[PDB]
Write a protein that binds this ligand. Structure first.
Ligand SMILES: Cc1cc2nc3c(=O)[nH]c(=O)nc-3n(C[C@H](O)[C@H](O)[C@H](O)COP(=O)(O)O)c2cc1C
Length: 169
């Protein structure tokens, strides 16, 4: 497929979101779903457009599978690639570290010459601090199944619609 979606998940929520994103884009013919747990960093080279999904765990840390491949990101040719991000988090329980993992990945990947695409507004959330916030916006789609599960479907629908422009669709 033209778009490669790489996600990591601990309790399965992020995988469910990844599947919904794939569906909104039009299915398997448009977006490839790849669990980062089973991927080599080089797998990310095969796509010109990437979607990176990662939930935040351990109080402001990356999900373990993303943590494992983090050091190899440096060897990937990210130059000129457009990359979008999404993450699952809990704004009530972790108000000071909401969506930090998504922020950690974007900071690293954007520093390797890629172009971040898919900024999202922070106004629909209530949190104190987040490493995923840049200039009053999230670097990607923030999903909260723990406190706002009823907003998930429309958030994905809206975000994908916005992404289609950026990915030449
Ligand atoms: C022990 C624990 C730590 C967590 N830490 C964070 C955190 O630091 N920041 C955040 O935004 N959410 C945090 N969460 C919420 C999870 O990211 C959230 O439940 C998410 O849906 C899990 O996604 P997954 O099923 O794809 O692994 C944590 C949840 C638990 C139970």
């Amino acid at each position: 497929a033209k778009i490669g979606l790489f996600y990591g998940t601990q309790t399965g929520v992020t995988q469910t979101i990844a599947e919904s994103i794939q569906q909104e884009f039009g299915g398997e013919s448009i977006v490839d779903l790849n669990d980062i747990a089973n991927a080599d960093a080089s797998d990310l080279n095969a796509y010109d457009y990437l979607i990176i999904g990662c939930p935040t765990w351990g109080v402001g840390e990356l999900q373990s599978d993303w943590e494992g491949i983090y050091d190899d990101l440096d060897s990937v040719n990210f130059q000129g690639k457009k990359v979008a991000y999404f993450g699952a988090g809990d704004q009530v329980g972790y108000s000071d570290n909401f969506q930090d993992a998504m922020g950690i990945l974007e900071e690293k990947i954007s520093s390797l010459g890629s172009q971040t695409v898919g900024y999202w507004p922070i106004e629909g959330y209530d949190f104190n601090e987040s490493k995923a916030v840049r200039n009053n916006q999230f670097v990607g789609l923030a999903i909260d199944e723990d406190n706002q599960p009823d907003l998930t479907k429309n958030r994905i629908k809206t975000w994908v619609s916005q992404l289609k422009s950026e990915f030449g669709l």
